[PDB]
Paper text:
The ubiquitin specific protease 7 (USP7), also known as herpes virus associated ubiquitin specific protease (HAUSP), is a well-characterized deubiquitinase. USP7 plays important roles in various biological processes, including cell survival, proliferation, apoptosis, tumorigenesis, viral infection, and epigenetic regulation through regulating the protein stability of tumor suppressors (p53, PTEN, FOXO, claspin), E3 ligases (MDM2, Mule, viral proteins ICP0), epigenetic regulators (DNMT1, Tip60, UHRF1). USP7 is comprised of three recognizable domains: the N-terminal TRAF domain, the catalytic domain, and the C-terminal Tandem UBL domain (designated TUDUSP7). To test this hypothesis, we first investigated the interaction between USP7 and the Herpes simplex virus type 1 (HSV1) regulatory protein ICP0 (also known as Vmw110), which is the first identified USP7-interacting protein and regulates the lytic and latent viral infection through inducing proteasomal degradation of various cellular proteins.
To investigate how ICP0 binds to TUDUSP7, we determined the crystal structure of TUDUSP7 in complex with ICP0 (613–633) at 2.70 Å resolution. As observed in previous studies, UBL1–2, UBL3, and UBL4–5 of TUDUSP7 form three separate modules and are connected by flexible regions flanking the UBL3. The ICP0 packs against an acidic groove on the surface of UBL1–2. As indicated in the TUDUSP7-ICP0 structure, the interaction is mediated by a network of hydrogen bonds and salt bridge contacts. Residue K620ICP0 forms hydrogen bonds with the carbonyl oxygen atoms of residues K681USP7, D684USP7 and side chain of D762USP7. Residue K624ICP0 snugly inserts into an acidic cavity, with the side chain stabilized by residues E759USP7 and D764USP7. Residues R626ICP0 and H627ICP0 form hydrogen bonds with side chain of residue D758USP7. Consistent with the observation from the structural analyses, mutations K624AICP0 (1KA) and K620A/K624AICP0 (2KA) of ICP0, largely decreased the binding affinities to TUDUSP7, compared with the wild-type ICP0, supporting the key role of these residues in mediating the intermolecular interaction. Structural comparison of USP7-DNMT1 and USP7-ICP0 indicates that ICP0 and KG-LinkerDNMT1 pack against the same acidic pocket of TUDUSP7 in an opposite orientation. Taken together, USP7 binds to distinct proteins on two separate sites, TRAF and the acidic pocket on TUDUSP7, respectively.
Author numbering:
A (entry chain B): 617 to 629
B (entry chain A): 556 to 1083
The structure:
């Protein structure tokens, strides 16, 4: 089924 | 003074959900206000060790608590993170934290008055479920209300979370809502479709993700910050600014909370409110750079932002702006021209007056500004005129058509306003005229005193001209007898036969057809 993301890849600084 | 083994230990900071209640910022708490339970733990100690120890320490069964380590991320957030309590339970404290010292962990527990009533730490399938945080935004109070957290399967659709949100917020069921994700400071993205599942709805779905919601209501538009998106852009740009009254010396001032993205109008509105008054009644000042104090006046129509105005403050000083409260409206104040001239009253004496017509105005306007201000004489005309004087001679009378922009008082005493005498109101145009009169004595460049307009009559004879001069000129017969009277044009003069010469009107007219050049005038020869 559907899963969570492992880490956050967007909108870094 | 560390002592031998201090380097084998780490600080673990535990934060409880009650610390999230009240927070108005991004994420779950403000690092500077949060209250921790602090543990000093061996770096090499295990997870089960700390967990059991913590259980007994805190007054909860070990089965009934859950640990969510706090995770500082490159995207500018600190968020609770997933920890498998069993799988990873034999890794070390320093391991599990990736060498963060101090290490912060969110500790989930049960009420436990609800735990007396039987409730338990919920099912968490680390693969198919997600823990989400819920915040409710109220536009009326402009605030965030912490609504706690939920567990839900990932595949559950956004629409199914609405009743829990309505419940936690005190909303009557089936109230329409707007949902946002709080991604990070200055990014709040509206969730467009409630009918998809959580993995599609949220940006990159993780435990600790935040949903912010609000009533979808027309009264929201009455608020200064109608949506959570706006609320968070505002909070991201907030800046405190001290305002001082320029007129009032040494004034410490008052602090107003503003946003760097505000324009002239918005700033005006806020400061105008804290003073209880019309924003149109204020004028503001820019900064002098490094010197404290008021700089140049800020036009009402300024196009920039508060950030532009604040850009010259260094990293740490108080940011400070000066204003002035205005007796009048600022668009008018800006366009106001200060016209200084002489009022000449019924007693033939001069007073200094400053009138303020509109700079686009005309002579008629300046005149009535002056008429509003003064006492006229006795019987008289109630009609005024404007003279232009240079070197104690009248160079000309001004017509009311004339725009005020056509004059330049190169001197403060150049312009005179005076009440028109009764004999001069409407002159009999064929047989009499007005002449300008000035005092001189050696030469005709030797002028002094107060000049004036005199009526002279055709065929009339000079002695009663001398008498007409007499009655107005304030003084008596002796060195009025000093006087020798001349007709003057440009370069030179000649002295009227004091008798007998009978007035011939234009020994005083200019060359026929020529207006622009200054007329002949009647000179008075006497000293002071």
């Amino acid at each position: 089924g559907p899963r969570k993301c492992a880490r956050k890849t967007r909108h870094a600084e | 003074p560390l002592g031998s083994e201090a380097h084998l230990y780490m600080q673990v900071q535990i934060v409880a959900e009650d610390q999230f209640c009240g927070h108005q910022g991004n994420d779950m708490y403000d690092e500077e206000k949060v209250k921790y339970t602090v543990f000093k733990v061996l770096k090499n100690s295990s997870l089960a060790e700390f967990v059991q120890s913590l259980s007994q320490t805190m007054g909860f069964p070990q089965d009934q608590i859950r640990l969510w380590p706090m995770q500082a991320r490159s995207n500018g957030t600190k968020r609770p993170a997933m920890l498998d309590n069993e799988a990873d339970g034999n890794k070390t404290m320093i391991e599990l934290s990736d060498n963060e010292n101090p290490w912060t962990i969110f500790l989930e527990t049960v009420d436990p008055e609800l735990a007396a009533s039987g409730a338990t730490l919920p099912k968490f399938d680390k693969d198919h479920d997600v823990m989400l945080f819920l915040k409710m935004y109220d536009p009326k109070t402009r605030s965030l209300n912490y609504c706690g957290h939920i567990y839900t399967p990932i595949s559950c659709k956004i629409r199914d979370l609405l009743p829990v949100m309505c419940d936690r917020a005190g909303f009557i069921q089936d109230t329409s809502l707007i949902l946002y994700e709080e991604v990070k400071p200055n990014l709040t993205e509206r969730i467009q479709d409630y009918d998809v599942s959580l993995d599609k709805a949220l940006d990159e779905l993780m435990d600790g993700d935040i949903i912010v919601f609000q009533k979808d209501d027309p009264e929201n538009d009455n608020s200064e910050l109608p949506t959570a998106k706006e609320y968070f852009r505002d909070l991201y740009h907030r800046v405190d600014v001290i305002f001082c009254d320029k007129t009032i010396p040494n004034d410490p001032g008052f602090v107003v909370t503003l946003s760097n993205r505000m324009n002239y109008f918005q700033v005006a509105k806020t400061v105008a409110q804290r003073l209880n008054t019309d924003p149109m009644l204020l004028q503001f000042f820019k900064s002098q750079g490094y010197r404290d104090g008021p700089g140049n006046p800020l036009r009402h129509n300024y196009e920039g932002t508060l950030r532009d105005l604040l850009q010259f403050f260094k990293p740490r000083q108080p940011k400070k702006l000066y204003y002035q409260q205005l007796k009048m409206k600022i668009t008018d104040f800006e366009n106001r021209r200060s016209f200084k001239c002489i009022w000449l009253n019924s007693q033939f004496r001069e007073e200094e007056i400053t009138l303020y017509p509109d700079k686009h105005g005309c002579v008629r306007d300046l005149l009535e500004e002056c008429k509003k201000a003064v006492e006229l004489g006795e019987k008289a005309s109630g009609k005024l005129r404007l003279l232009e004087i240079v070197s104690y001679k009248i160079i000309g009378v001004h017509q009311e058509d004339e725009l005020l922009e056509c004059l330049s008082p190169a001197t403060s005493r150049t312009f005179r306003i005076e009440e028109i005498p009764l004999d001069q109101v409407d002159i009999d145009k064929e047989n009499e005229m007005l002449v300008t009169v000035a005092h001189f004595h050696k030469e005709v460049f030797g002028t002094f005193g107060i000049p004036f307009l005199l009526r002279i009559h055709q065929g009339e004879h000079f002695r009663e001209v001398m008498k007409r001069i007499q009655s107005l000129l304030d003084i008596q017969e002796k060195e009025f007898e000093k006087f020798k009277f001349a007709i003057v044009m440009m370069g030179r003069h000649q002295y009227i036969n004091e008798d007998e010469y009978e007035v011939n009107l234009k020994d005083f007219e200019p060359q026929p057809g020529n207006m622009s050049h200054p007329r002949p005038w009647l000179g008075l020869d006497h000293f002071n």
